[PDB]
């Protein structure tokens, strides 16, 4: 996308979202990141939405194929699960590469730095979901380390109702439950996050209250499923 203006890439990413063309959306936002300038709050959200939709479709397909393969246990099911898995890994490596070149290193404000470190944790988590063996171990630690740095910054720099702080805690709890085999850590983190946010709701406007309570309900939904 080197010959397209930054502002045109951002405009086309918004059009692609409206058209439900998420692969295009991700390609436009990759092009915008590769312009080298930092991203605004809205632009970070466009980047994240685009790639979450692309990898979300790949993960759903991988789970369908993995379930068929496990039931079967010719080469075709394994071959096709492997093709989807390689494509998914490639998308995760692309996102991680954007974060490493050079979004995280240039992110100084807590809102941008926590946002990017949460993304780093999420995309290592999606790598971990398909990883097998000792490879899994280093990938799992990379996810954990990114989430933990984001948690440490968020607890020092953001109020307990901040939606990025809340979504980070939600996703790190899912990491604990689903990836790290630490359901008790997942439940503790979700409960503490929910309770600390509850106690800070009185400080918020009506619109901020709606944003924070929406994510708190996701924490409660997981706690209900886990307990």
């Amino acid at each position: 996308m080197g010959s397209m203006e930054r502002a045109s890439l951002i405009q086309k990413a918004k059009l692609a979202e409206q058209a439900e063309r998420y692969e295009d959306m991700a390609a436009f936002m990759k092009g915008a990141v590769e312009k080298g300038e930092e991203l605004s709050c809205e632009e970070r959200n466009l980047l994240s939405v685009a790639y979450k939709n692309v990898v979300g479709g790949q993960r759903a397909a991988w789970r369908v194929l993995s379930s068929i393969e496990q039931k079967s246990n010719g080469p075709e099911v394994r071959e096709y699960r492997e093709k989807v898995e390689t494509e998914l890994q490639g998308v995760c490596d692309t996102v991680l590469g954007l974060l490493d070149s050079h979004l995280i290193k240039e992110a100084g404000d807590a809102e941008s730095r926590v946002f990017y470190l949460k993304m780093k944790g999420d995309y290592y988590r999606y790598l971990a979901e398909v990883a097998t063996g000792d490879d899994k171990k280093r990938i799992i630690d990379s996810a954990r380390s990114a989430y933990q740095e984001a948690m440490d910054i968020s607890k020092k720099e953001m109020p307990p109702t901040n939606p990025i702080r809340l979504g980070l805690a939600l996703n790190f709890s899912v990491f604990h439950y689903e990836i790290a085999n630490s359901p008790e850590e997942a439940i503790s983190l979700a409960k503490t996050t929910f309770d600390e946010a509850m106690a800070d709701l009185h400080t918020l406007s009506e619109d901020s209250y709606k944003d924070s309570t929406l994510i708190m309900q996701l924490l409660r939904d997981n706690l209900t499923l886990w307990t």
Partner: peptide
């Protein structure tokens, strides 16, 4: 369980 959907914005 569920992570942040994160698929609309």
């Amino acid at each position: 369980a569920g992570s942040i959907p994160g698929r609309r914005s």
